[PDB]
Design a protein around this ligand. Structure first.
Ligand SMILES: CC(C)(COP(=O)(O)OP(=O)(O)OC[C@H]1O[C@@H](n2cnc3c(N)ncnc32)[C@H](O)[C@@H]1OP(=O)(O)O)[C@@H](O)C(=O)NCCC(=O)NCCS
Ligand SMILES: CC(C)(COP(=O)(O)OP(=O)(O)OC[C@H]1O[C@@H](n2cnc3c(N)ncnc32)[C@H](O)[C@@H]1OP(=O)(O)O)[C@@H](O)C(=O)NCCC(=O)NCCS
Ligand SMILES: CC(C)(COP(=O)(O)OP(=O)(O)OC[C@H]1O[C@@H](n2cnc3c(N)ncnc32)[C@H](O)[C@@H]1OP(=O)(O)O)[C@@H](O)C(=O)NCCC(=O)NCCS
Ligand SMILES: CC(C)(COP(=O)(O)OP(=O)(O)OC[C@H]1O[C@@H](n2cnc3c(N)ncnc32)[C@H](O)[C@@H]1OP(=O)(O)O)[C@@H](O)C(=O)NCCC(=O)NCCS
Ligand SMILES: CC(C)(COP(=O)(O)OP(=O)(O)OC[C@H]1O[C@@H](n2cnc3c(N)ncnc32)[C@H](O)[C@@H]1OP(=O)(O)O)[C@@H](O)C(=O)NCCC(=O)NCCS
Ligand SMILES: CC(C)(COP(=O)(O)OP(=O)(O)OC[C@H]1O[C@@H](n2cnc3c(N)ncnc32)[C@H](O)[C@@H]1OP(=O)(O)O)[C@@H](O)C(=O)NCCC(=O)NCCS
Ligand SMILES: [Ca+2]
Ligand SMILES: [Ca+2]
Ligand SMILES: [Ca+2]
Ligand SMILES: [Ca+2]
Ligand SMILES: [Ca+2]
Ligand SMILES: [Ca+2]
Ligand SMILES: [Ca+2]
Ligand SMILES: [Ca+2]
Ligand SMILES: [Ca+2]
Lengths: 142, 148, 142, 148, 148, 142
């Protein structure tokens, strides 16, 4: 298995990211995915976006403080105001052996909505939007 | 908590948190991921109570966010345990908001809900059997399920 | 002893809340009380409030990282611009035995002042203020 | 530090801190609780110096906040040890501000002060006797009291 | 990454970070010190990979910051190992930005770069010999230097 | 060796300041220096300043969580929009013996630039600027 999508965030898991027990917890990973996914969404949407939905998720492997956490992003659909982005979470191991090993922690599809200043949906511009063109072209394969 | 449609919060209050500047995305908006984080953290308090020790998250079901939250709003996570297996515990978390930043001030609404699946683990991250003898938190959870 | 007031904040004591030694310290508790008390004050005041005063306080029991910390709020007086709120701090134990036990850590009365945009005192509105009515009605017993 | 009324800071500088965005309440205001936190943290530096180890807070006296603080202002906590008992230490903390955000820029004023009571404890949180033999920090504190 | 002058990023991506509200100075600006912090943290990931354990920073060379960064912009640190000695490792860190907050949106530029010197240390902070037998990270680093 | 300059920041090294390994790292110290140096720069500049440059630096001693960290500031030159500030970093030991000992960790010269609202350089006002006068007078000795 190889990563799919563009790299969105590459983040060290820090002590301030853990729960009270010192474990990197699922919520922190969900939060990285949402934040990272939205970078790509905003790029395509040319402005403010919000998360309207996320698909179910399974966490297959643990993450330790010190480990490097990568979020990868793949736009699957662009609607009028909505954008579906698939986010994969990959870890490069630092804290314990085998050091340097890369593994997939989870993935999920997020749906974002392009919004105006008042929080209402807006049409993603289609004219002179090369971020949208790049995304559609990638979908037209996959 | 009770909304315009007459829905009421279900379960026990896990967390009651103010949405703060340091919780927003870079644009200053309260974002899905922060809510997701609060749900997991809050759900796991209940799961750890029942499990009698360390728990990890293995699954979360799909979620929709129906209404935005502003900085300054009060954000509440309520939990109900829906299933306890050998080492697994399913907790449904509802997120309720009490409006502070914008009118109508004081309005309550439900932003989202979702079932989290947690697993009781030891120190090595290996699954462990939830203790069923003399577990008052579990008995209370199971009585709640027979009733709900 | 039972809690008195409405629940204002329910917060996990986190590693990022400790002093440099890893102890939950009195300052953090004072800070929660002030923040939590002010929620109720703002409700009644219908806008911006600041803390003008806090009564003396004693810390009777320690709090451990992992423990759940609850602030409870009881409005004792509403003046023209000032509001006195009694805050109690209760802990539900997670970190050590007995697990699940609830105890009172401290309590104190905070005085808040309703302020305008420039930091000057303003009259708390008395007309169509059901938060004020609820508070006054509770005082008329308690 | 010296204000318009001619008051001057008393004691030793414990902390010198910028009021930051992440220190505000949700409205963006620097709030009482953050100042209270800084006082306790800063006072305890002096208390730990004298006590020769771990200290906890047992009491704080009443406090008034006379003037607001803006984000960007410099906030200083000064401490004077007023009493050392067997295991207890009383530290008076004054909070001084140097104005940055708003005019008059550079003005200094005292926001609040209060006496904190700390107790020297061991690892189990049990009170311990402050060492009185060969304690230069204590000797300095006591000489300051006879004079301050 | 590729700018208007045709410069391209050199090395491996160490960190890819959003500039957040909580990273600014009190005025809300992204400041030199935060960038400096990210460079050191990111450079040390590569240094620790090669060194096979703990590393500390002993030196940083001079730096200029050519262009400001806004909150919301994506900030990337790229690293190239330039020298490995007995216990020392020199990593050049370039900071690249992808514009988000302001036009032109999506533009990439290099804010700064600088060489950090790290030292491989044990648990007591004492320098240790970087292992040269069976060190694939070191072999890769050295092959990159002979080429680049 | 004695400290030189005015005290700019006096900060406890906290757990949330460490890298993922729990070490106070050079980046955090650089960040304190830049922040602290800029206080003095803003004072003299009478408004917004940014960092355009920093000199090379060497870190001679380690800092432990719990230790007190002081940044000291000495303005070396005022140009039209630029200000050179020398920052020294001193530690008073708390975490390990000898407790109370003070040592110098590093020093470096930072160059700040006075900027307007749009990020462009502006002339530091020379009229009715007693912060500038104090700095120039200190330079005239150093
Ligand atoms: C997102 C939001 C504006 C959509 O409201 P709305 O009344 O349905 O707006 P619209 O009818 O214009 O729908 C906008 C788009 O979202 C899509 N959508 C709505 N609900 C959806 C859901 N549950 N799942 C997937 N797509 C959804 C619509 O089909 C539409 O798509 P399109 O424009 O590509 O055709 C509103 O639900 C909201 O503000 N939610 C909170 C968002 C938020 O702040 N999240 C952060 C965490 S709280
Ligand atoms: C928790 C973990 C040890 C379970 O792994 P495992 O090999 O499947 O162990 P088990 O097969 O015994 O499963 C334990 C329980 O979880 C349940 N479970 C496992 N995978 C599940 C899934 N994806 N969805 C729902 N339930 C699941 C099992 O049915 C089992 O239930 P039971 O004991 O009540 O009958 C493992 O998946 C893990 O360590 N994941 C990382 C968790 C984590 O750190 N998450 C947060 C950040 S990544
Ligand atoms: C709060 C503040 C506006 C009051 O200033 P002021 O000149 O006394 O204003 P007023 O005379 O209008 O007094 C306002 C109310 O506060 C009350 N008050 C003033 N000082 C008080 C004190 N020490 N204790 C209790 N109440 C007090 C007054 O009696 C009056 O009450 P009322 O309107 O119900 O009759 C001013 O002291 C201030 O801005 N302080 C700093 C507040 C702050 O920012 N705190 C956060 C931590 S720094
Ligand atoms: C510190 C603590 C062990 C002291 O408890 P204790 O049973 O009263 O122990 P002692 O009776 O020996 O009191 C120790 C000293 O504190 C003083 N003291 C106790 N309570 C006090 C009070 N409420 N106000 C002022 N001084 C007080 C005593 O007079 C005694 O003084 P001395 O040794 O100088 O003569 C205890 O109260 C505690 O652990 N509280 C929690 C502290 C804490 O964690 N606070 C921060 C967050 S909750
Ligand atoms: C600082 C900045 C405005 C200067 O741009 P500029 O086009 O050179 O502006 P100027 O020509 O007016 O130069 C302004 C001053 O800086 C000085 N300066 C410029 N580059 C310098 C450098 N590398 N080292 C020292 N001084 C420098 C100039 O000599 C001039 O000094 P003076 O007014 O006292 O005579 C621009 O480089 C910038 O915005 N950089 C990013 C700053 C930033 O945001 N840093 C935070 C971390 S990213
Ligand atoms: C790392 C440290 C142990 C090295 O100290 P030392 O007594 O000089 O040890 P050494 O003489 O063996 O030097 C180790 C290596 O660093 C190099 N080095 C030392 N000082 C240097 C300097 N100031 N500039 C560039 N390289 C330097 C040496 O040349 C040597 O290289 P080599 O092993 O590849 O041949 C020490 O300086 C230290 O603990 N400093 C604190 C580091 C720290 O905590 N920084 C972050 C926050 S303060
Ligand atoms: Ca290896
Ligand atoms: Ca809180
Ligand atoms: Ca109302
Ligand atoms: Ca029990
Ligand atoms: Ca600071
Ligand atoms: Ca002036
Ligand atoms: Ca991040
Ligand atoms: Ca564009
Ligand atoms: Ca000593």
């Amino acid at each position: 298995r190889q990563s799919k999508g563009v790299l969105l965030l590459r983040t060290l898991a820090m002590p301030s990211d853990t729960n009270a027990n010192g474990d990197i917890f699922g919520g922190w990973i969900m939060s990285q995915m949402d934040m990272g996914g939205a970078i790509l969404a905003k790029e395509i949407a040319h402005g403010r976006v919000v998360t309207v939905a996320v698909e179910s998720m399974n966490f297959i492997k643990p993450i330790s403080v010190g480990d490097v956490v990568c979020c990868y992003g793949q736009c699957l659909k662009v609607g009028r105001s909505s954008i579906k982005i698939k986010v994969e979470v990959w870890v490069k191991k630092v804290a314990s052996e085998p050091i340097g090993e890369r593994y997939c922690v989870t993935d999920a599809v997020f749906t974002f909505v392009a919004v105006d200043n008042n929080g209402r949906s807006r049409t993603i511009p289609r004219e002179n939007n090369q971020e949208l063109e790049k995304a559609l072209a990638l979908i037209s394969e996959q």
